[PDB]
Paper text:
Viral replication requires a 3C-like cysteine protease (3CLpro) which processes the 200 kDa viral polyprotein into six functional proteins. The 3C-like protease (3CLpro) was named because of its similarity to the picornavirus 3C protease. It is a cysteine protease which shows a typical chymotrypsin-like fold containing two domains: a β-barrel domain and a β-sheet domain separated by a groove where the active site is located. The active site is characterised by a catalytic dyad (Cys139-His30) or triad (Cys139-His30-Glu54) and shows a strong preference for a –D/E-F/Y-X-L-Q-G-P- (X can be H, Q, or E) sequence corresponding to the subsites S5-S4-S3-S2-S1-S1′-S2′. The key role of norovirus 3CLpro in the processing of the polyprotein and the absence of homologues in the human host make it an excellent target for antiviral drug discovery.
Fragment J12 is the worst in terms of resolution, diffracting to approximately 2.1 Å, although the electron density is still of good quality. Screening with the DSPL library and part of the Maybridge Ro3 library identified 19 ligands in total which bind in five different sites, as illustrated in Fig. 2.
Residue numbers in the entry:
A (entry chain A): 1 to 172
B (entry chain B): 3 to 173
Amino acid sequence: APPTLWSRVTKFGSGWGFWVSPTVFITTTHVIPTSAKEFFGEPLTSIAIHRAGEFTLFRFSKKIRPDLTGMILEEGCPEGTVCSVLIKRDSGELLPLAVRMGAIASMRIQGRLVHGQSGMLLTGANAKGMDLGTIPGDCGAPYVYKRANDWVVCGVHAAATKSGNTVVCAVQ
Amino acid sequence: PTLWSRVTKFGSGWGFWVSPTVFITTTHVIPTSAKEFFGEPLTSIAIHRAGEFTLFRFSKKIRPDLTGMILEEGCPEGTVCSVLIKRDSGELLPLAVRMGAIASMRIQGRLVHGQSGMLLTGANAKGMDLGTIPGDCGAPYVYKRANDWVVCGVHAAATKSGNTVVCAVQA
Ligand SMILES: CC(C)(CO)NC(=O)c1cccc(Cl)c1
Protein backbone atom coordinates (compact mmCIF):
# COMPACT_ATOMS: atom_id res chain seq x y z
CA ALA A 1 0.00 0.00 0.00
CA PRO A 2 1.38 3.54 -0.70
CA PRO A 3 3.73 5.12 1.91
CA THR A 4 1.41 8.19 2.23
CA LEU A 5 -1.39 5.87 3.62
CA TRP A 6 0.99 4.19 6.14
CA SER A 7 2.20 7.70 7.33
CA ARG A 8 -1.45 8.49 8.37
CA VAL A 9 -1.69 5.42 10.70
CA THR A 10 -0.97 6.75 14.24
CA LYS A 11 -0.59 4.84 17.55
CA PHE A 12 -3.55 5.98 19.75
CA GLY A 13 -4.95 4.88 23.09
CA SER A 14 -5.20 1.03 23.15
CA GLY A 15 -4.93 0.87 19.31
CA TRP A 16 -4.70 3.20 16.29
CA GLY A 17 -6.25 6.11 14.42
CA PHE A 18 -6.00 7.58 10.89
CA TRP A 19 -5.43 11.12 9.47
CA VAL A 20 -7.99 11.69 6.60
CA SER A 21 -6.68 15.28 6.23
CA PRO A 22 -4.47 17.81 8.13
CA THR A 23 -7.53 18.56 10.45
CA VAL A 24 -9.55 15.23 10.48
CA PHE A 25 -8.57 12.12 12.55
CA ILE A 26 -10.75 8.95 12.74
CA THR A 27 -10.64 6.00 15.20
CA THR A 28 -12.61 3.24 16.96
CA THR A 29 -14.60 4.62 19.93
CA HIS A 30 -13.45 1.94 22.46
CA VAL A 31 -9.64 2.60 21.97
CA ILE A 32 -9.98 6.33 23.09
CA PRO A 33 -8.60 6.92 26.65
CA THR A 34 -11.81 7.83 28.62
CA SER A 35 -9.84 10.29 30.92
CA ALA A 36 -8.23 12.23 27.96
CA LYS A 37 -8.85 16.08 27.90
CA GLU A 38 -6.04 17.00 25.39
CA PHE A 39 -5.20 15.60 21.87
CA PHE A 40 -2.13 16.64 19.76
CA GLY A 41 -1.60 19.69 22.09
CA GLU A 42 -5.26 20.95 21.65
CA PRO A 43 -7.83 21.14 24.48
CA LEU A 44 -11.23 19.34 24.09
CA THR A 45 -12.93 22.80 23.74
CA SER A 46 -11.05 23.34 20.37
CA ILE A 47 -12.20 19.96 18.84
CA ALA A 48 -15.51 18.93 17.14
CA ILE A 49 -16.22 15.23 17.92
CA HIS A 50 -18.69 13.22 15.73
CA ARG A 51 -19.48 9.77 17.27
CA ALA A 52 -21.61 7.00 15.64
CA GLY A 53 -21.42 3.81 17.80
CA GLU A 54 -17.84 2.36 17.31
CA PHE A 55 -16.89 5.17 14.79
CA THR A 56 -15.42 8.48 16.12
CA LEU A 57 -14.28 11.50 14.00
CA PHE A 58 -12.19 14.39 15.51
CA ARG A 59 -12.09 17.74 13.56
CA PHE A 60 -9.34 20.18 14.78
CA SER A 61 -9.42 24.05 14.48
CA LYS A 62 -5.74 24.06 13.23
CA LYS A 63 -3.68 21.88 10.79
CA ILE A 64 -2.16 19.17 13.06
CA ARG A 65 -0.72 17.22 10.02
CA PRO A 66 0.09 19.85 7.32
CA ASP A 67 2.36 17.31 5.47
CA LEU A 68 -0.87 15.51 4.34
CA THR A 69 -3.39 15.90 1.52
CA GLY A 70 -7.13 15.45 2.26
CA MET A 71 -8.38 12.06 0.87
CA ILE A 72 -11.95 10.57 0.33
CA LEU A 73 -13.74 9.01 3.38
CA GLU A 74 -16.87 7.02 2.51
CA GLU A 75 -19.59 5.26 4.60
CA GLY A 76 -18.32 1.68 3.98
CA CYS A 77 -17.99 0.22 0.45
CA PRO A 78 -19.98 -1.85 -2.10
CA GLU A 79 -20.53 -5.56 -1.21
CA GLY A 80 -17.69 -7.59 -2.81
CA THR A 81 -15.04 -4.81 -2.59
CA VAL A 82 -11.59 -6.22 -1.58
CA CYS A 83 -9.97 -3.85 0.99
CA SER A 84 -6.63 -3.89 2.90
CA VAL A 85 -6.61 -3.29 6.70
CA LEU A 86 -3.37 -1.29 7.39
CA ILE A 87 -2.04 -2.99 10.56
CA LYS A 88 1.36 -1.98 12.16
CA ARG A 89 3.12 -4.78 14.14
CA ASP A 90 6.28 -5.36 16.33
CA SER A 91 9.15 -3.44 14.72
CA GLY A 92 8.30 -1.40 11.61
CA GLU A 93 6.49 -4.51 10.30
CA LEU A 94 3.55 -3.51 8.10
CA LEU A 95 0.64 -6.05 7.63
CA PRO A 96 -1.94 -5.00 4.93
CA LEU A 97 -4.48 -7.82 5.54
CA ALA A 98 -6.74 -8.56 2.51
CA VAL A 99 -10.55 -8.61 3.38
CA ARG A 100 -13.60 -9.25 1.07
CA MET A 101 -16.33 -6.86 2.33
CA GLY A 102 -19.99 -7.95 2.90
CA ALA A 103 -23.27 -6.64 4.40
CA ILE A 104 -23.88 -4.15 7.24
CA ALA A 105 -24.20 -6.42 10.33
CA SER A 106 -24.92 -6.55 14.07
CA MET A 107 -22.98 -9.28 16.00
CA ARG A 108 -21.98 -10.41 19.52
CA ILE A 109 -18.13 -10.90 19.72
CA GLN A 110 -16.48 -11.99 23.00
CA GLY A 111 -19.79 -11.02 24.77
CA ARG A 112 -19.71 -7.39 23.34
CA LEU A 113 -22.35 -6.04 20.84
CA VAL A 114 -20.75 -4.63 17.62
CA HIS A 115 -22.28 -2.96 14.51
CA GLY A 116 -20.57 -2.02 11.18
CA GLN A 117 -19.68 -3.46 7.75
CA SER A 118 -18.76 -7.18 8.01
CA GLY A 119 -15.94 -8.78 5.98
CA MET A 120 -14.01 -12.08 5.56
CA LEU A 121 -10.18 -12.16 5.70
CA LEU A 122 -8.49 -13.60 2.57
CA THR A 123 -5.25 -14.56 4.44
CA GLY A 124 -5.80 -18.36 5.16
CA ALA A 125 -8.33 -21.17 5.89
CA ASN A 126 -8.92 -19.62 9.37
CA ALA A 127 -7.19 -16.47 10.69
CA LYS A 128 -6.89 -17.57 14.39
CA GLY A 129 -3.75 -15.93 15.92
CA MET A 130 -1.42 -13.00 15.05
CA ASP A 131 0.41 -14.39 11.92
CA LEU A 132 -2.69 -14.51 9.60
CA GLY A 133 -5.30 -12.48 11.60
CA THR A 134 -6.09 -9.50 13.87
CA ILE A 135 -5.42 -8.94 17.61
CA PRO A 136 -7.24 -6.58 20.03
CA GLY A 137 -4.44 -3.95 19.68
CA ASP A 138 -5.25 -3.62 15.90
CA CYS A 139 -8.54 -1.77 16.63
CA GLY A 140 -8.68 1.64 14.88
CA ALA A 141 -6.60 0.46 11.83
CA PRO A 142 -8.06 1.78 8.54
CA TYR A 143 -9.90 -0.18 5.77
CA VAL A 144 -8.68 1.21 2.36
CA TYR A 145 -9.10 0.26 -1.31
CA LYS A 146 -8.00 1.58 -4.72
CA ARG A 147 -10.61 2.84 -7.30
CA ALA A 148 -7.84 2.15 -9.90
CA ASN A 149 -6.94 5.88 -10.00
CA ASP A 150 -7.20 6.90 -6.30
CA TRP A 151 -7.42 5.36 -2.81
CA VAL A 152 -10.52 5.56 -0.49
CA VAL A 153 -10.76 4.98 3.30
CA CYS A 154 -14.15 3.47 4.24
CA GLY A 155 -13.83 2.83 8.03
CA VAL A 156 -11.82 1.58 11.06
CA HIS A 157 -11.25 -1.86 12.62
CA ALA A 158 -13.78 -2.51 15.44
CA ALA A 159 -13.78 -6.30 16.20
CA ALA A 160 -12.98 -9.80 14.93
CA THR A 161 -14.24 -13.30 15.87
CA LYS A 162 -11.90 -15.40 18.08
CA SER A 163 -11.42 -18.40 15.83
CA GLY A 164 -12.62 -17.09 12.57
CA ASN A 165 -12.21 -15.05 9.41
CA THR A 166 -14.92 -12.46 10.26
CA VAL A 167 -14.02 -8.76 10.91
CA VAL A 168 -16.21 -5.62 11.48
CA CYS A 169 -15.30 -2.16 9.99
CA ALA A 170 -17.03 0.74 11.94
CA VAL A 171 -18.42 3.27 9.35
CA GLN A 172 -19.45 6.97 9.42
CA PRO B 1 7.63 -16.44 18.58
CA THR B 2 6.30 -15.99 14.95
CA LEU B 3 6.36 -17.84 11.56
CA TRP B 4 7.31 -14.46 9.97
CA SER B 5 10.81 -14.45 11.69
CA ARG B 6 11.57 -17.63 9.61
CA VAL B 7 11.10 -15.81 6.21
CA THR B 8 14.56 -14.48 5.14
CA LYS B 9 15.83 -12.47 2.12
CA PHE B 10 18.01 -14.83 -0.01
CA GLY B 11 19.57 -14.43 -3.48
CA SER B 12 17.02 -12.96 -5.93
CA GLY B 13 14.04 -13.90 -3.63
CA TRP B 14 13.38 -15.45 -0.18
CA GLY B 15 13.61 -18.65 1.87
CA PHE B 16 12.28 -20.23 5.09
CA TRP B 17 13.90 -21.67 8.28
CA VAL B 18 12.19 -25.04 9.01
CA SER B 19 14.51 -25.59 12.02
CA PRO B 20 17.74 -24.16 13.50
CA THR B 21 19.72 -26.14 10.82
CA VAL B 22 17.24 -26.53 7.85
CA PHE B 23 16.53 -23.76 5.25
CA ILE B 24 14.24 -24.25 2.12
CA THR B 25 14.04 -21.98 -1.00
CA THR B 26 13.24 -21.94 -4.74
CA THR B 27 16.15 -23.32 -6.83
CA HIS B 28 16.21 -20.40 -9.38
CA VAL B 29 16.67 -17.63 -6.67
CA ILE B 30 19.92 -19.21 -5.26
CA PRO B 31 23.20 -17.34 -6.07
CA THR B 32 25.22 -19.18 -8.76
CA SER B 33 28.53 -17.74 -7.35
CA ALA B 34 29.14 -18.30 -3.57
CA LYS B 35 31.69 -19.63 -1.00
CA GLU B 36 29.42 -19.30 2.13
CA PHE B 37 25.75 -18.76 3.16
CA PHE B 38 24.86 -17.17 6.56
CA GLY B 39 28.59 -17.16 7.51
CA GLU B 40 28.98 -20.96 7.03
CA PRO B 41 31.43 -22.24 4.35
CA LEU B 42 29.62 -24.08 1.47
CA THR B 43 32.16 -26.85 2.36
CA SER B 44 29.93 -27.75 5.43
CA ILE B 45 26.40 -27.40 3.86
CA ALA B 46 24.36 -30.36 2.46
CA ILE B 47 22.28 -29.31 -0.65
CA HIS B 48 19.24 -31.46 -1.71
CA ARG B 49 17.66 -30.22 -4.99
CA ALA B 50 14.45 -31.54 -6.67
CA GLY B 51 13.48 -29.30 -9.64
CA GLU B 52 12.44 -25.86 -8.27
CA PHE B 53 12.64 -27.09 -4.56
CA THR B 54 16.03 -26.84 -2.72
CA LEU B 55 16.76 -27.81 0.96
CA PHE B 56 19.96 -26.73 2.80
CA ARG B 57 21.12 -28.64 5.95
CA PHE B 58 23.82 -26.71 7.99
CA SER B 59 26.48 -28.41 10.23
CA LYS B 60 25.69 -26.03 13.16
CA LYS B 61 22.68 -24.12 14.58
CA ILE B 62 22.22 -20.91 12.48
CA ARG B 63 18.80 -20.11 14.10
CA PRO B 64 18.99 -21.59 17.65
CA ASP B 65 15.98 -19.36 18.63
CA LEU B 66 13.63 -21.60 16.48
CA THR B 67 11.87 -24.95 17.03
CA GLY B 68 11.64 -27.57 14.23
CA MET B 69 8.39 -27.52 12.17
CA ILE B 70 6.61 -30.23 10.03
CA LEU B 71 7.68 -30.23 6.34
CA GLU B 72 5.44 -32.26 3.96
CA GLU B 73 5.40 -32.93 0.14
CA GLY B 74 2.50 -30.60 -0.76
CA CYS B 75 -0.97 -30.84 0.83
CA PRO B 76 -4.42 -32.37 0.07
CA GLU B 77 -6.43 -30.82 -2.80
CA GLY B 78 -8.86 -28.20 -1.48
CA THR B 79 -6.54 -27.13 1.40
CA VAL B 80 -6.51 -23.30 1.79
CA CYS B 81 -2.75 -22.54 2.27
CA SER B 82 -1.21 -19.14 3.18
CA VAL B 83 1.74 -17.90 1.06
CA LEU B 84 3.90 -15.82 3.57
CA ILE B 85 5.14 -13.03 1.24
CA LYS B 86 7.75 -10.44 2.47
CA ARG B 87 8.31 -7.27 0.38
CA ASP B 88 11.42 -4.99 0.33
CA SER B 89 8.89 -2.21 1.39
CA GLY B 90 8.69 -3.83 4.89
CA GLU B 91 5.16 -5.27 4.14
CA LEU B 92 4.16 -8.81 5.27
CA LEU B 93 1.40 -10.14 2.90
CA PRO B 94 -0.21 -13.46 3.89
CA LEU B 95 -2.50 -14.53 0.99
CA ALA B 96 -4.98 -17.50 0.95
CA VAL B 97 -4.31 -19.98 -1.90
CA ARG B 98 -6.73 -22.85 -2.72
CA MET B 99 -4.49 -25.87 -3.64
CA GLY B 100 -4.98 -28.27 -6.61
CA ALA B 101 -3.18 -31.21 -8.22
CA ILE B 102 0.58 -31.61 -8.72
CA ALA B 103 1.31 -30.98 -12.44
CA SER B 104 3.80 -29.70 -15.07
CA MET B 105 2.32 -26.26 -15.95
CA ARG B 106 3.07 -23.71 -18.72
CA ILE B 107 3.68 -20.34 -16.89
CA GLN B 108 4.86 -17.31 -19.01
CA GLY B 109 6.51 -19.56 -21.66
CA ARG B 110 8.26 -22.11 -19.31
CA LEU B 111 7.33 -25.53 -17.82
CA VAL B 112 7.21 -25.57 -14.01
CA HIS B 113 6.51 -28.77 -11.96
CA GLY B 114 4.77 -28.42 -8.55
CA GLN B 115 1.40 -28.12 -6.76
CA SER B 116 -1.08 -25.78 -8.55
CA GLY B 117 -2.97 -23.11 -6.55
CA MET B 118 -5.44 -20.21 -7.07
CA LEU B 119 -5.58 -17.05 -4.82
CA LEU B 120 -8.94 -16.32 -3.02
CA THR B 121 -8.41 -12.58 -4.09
CA GLY B 122 -9.05 -14.00 -7.63
CA ALA B 123 -10.68 -11.35 -9.83
CA ASN B 124 -7.51 -9.49 -10.98
CA ALA B 125 -5.99 -5.96 -10.60
CA LYS B 126 -3.69 -7.16 -7.73
CA GLY B 127 -1.98 -3.68 -7.94
CA MET B 128 -3.30 -3.40 -4.34
CA ASP B 129 -1.23 -6.02 -2.30
CA LEU B 130 -3.63 -8.73 -3.62
CA GLY B 131 -1.33 -10.96 -5.76
CA THR B 132 2.25 -12.24 -6.25
CA ILE B 133 5.15 -10.49 -8.08
CA PRO B 134 8.38 -12.10 -9.47
CA GLY B 135 10.55 -10.98 -6.47
CA ASP B 136 8.31 -13.12 -4.13
CA CYS B 137 9.85 -16.49 -5.25
CA GLY B 138 10.99 -18.72 -2.32
CA ALA B 139 8.12 -17.51 -0.01
CA PRO B 140 6.66 -20.49 1.96
CA TYR B 141 3.23 -22.18 1.62
CA VAL B 142 1.88 -23.05 5.15
CA TYR B 143 -1.40 -24.18 6.77
CA LYS B 144 -2.70 -25.03 10.27
CA ARG B 145 -3.57 -28.71 10.94
CA ALA B 146 -4.76 -29.46 14.51
CA ASN B 147 -2.58 -27.16 16.73
CA ASP B 148 0.30 -27.62 14.25
CA TRP B 149 1.62 -25.45 11.40
CA VAL B 150 2.75 -27.42 8.28
CA VAL B 151 5.09 -26.04 5.61
CA CYS B 152 4.36 -27.78 2.28
CA GLY B 153 6.53 -25.92 -0.32
CA VAL B 154 7.99 -22.69 -1.77
CA HIS B 155 6.71 -20.12 -4.32
CA ALA B 156 8.21 -21.08 -7.81
CA ALA B 157 6.05 -19.16 -10.40
CA ALA B 158 2.77 -17.28 -11.19
CA THR B 159 0.69 -16.34 -14.27
CA LYS B 160 0.62 -12.68 -15.50
CA SER B 161 -2.37 -11.95 -13.12
CA GLY B 162 -0.34 -13.19 -10.06
CA ASN B 163 -3.53 -15.25 -9.19
CA THR B 164 -2.66 -18.77 -10.65
CA VAL B 165 0.52 -20.03 -8.82
CA VAL B 166 2.91 -23.03 -8.51
CA CYS B 167 4.28 -24.29 -5.09
CA ALA B 168 7.53 -26.34 -5.61
CA VAL B 169 7.45 -29.44 -3.31
CA GLN B 170 10.01 -31.84 -1.75
CA ALA B 171 10.77 -35.21 -3.49
C1 LIG C 1 -0.57 5.24 22.41
C2 LIG C 1 -0.57 5.75 23.86
C3 LIG C 1 0.80 5.56 24.51
C4 LIG C 1 -0.95 7.24 23.89
O1 LIG C 1 -2.21 7.51 23.26
N1 LIG C 1 -1.62 4.95 24.61
C5 LIG C 1 -2.00 5.15 25.89
O2 LIG C 1 -1.50 6.03 26.58
C6 LIG C 1 -3.07 4.25 26.46
C7 LIG C 1 -3.11 2.89 26.16
C8 LIG C 1 -4.09 2.09 26.71
C9 LIG C 1 -5.04 2.63 27.56
C10 LIG C 1 -4.99 3.98 27.87
CL1 LIG C 1 -6.14 4.66 29.01
C11 LIG C 1 -4.02 4.78 27.32
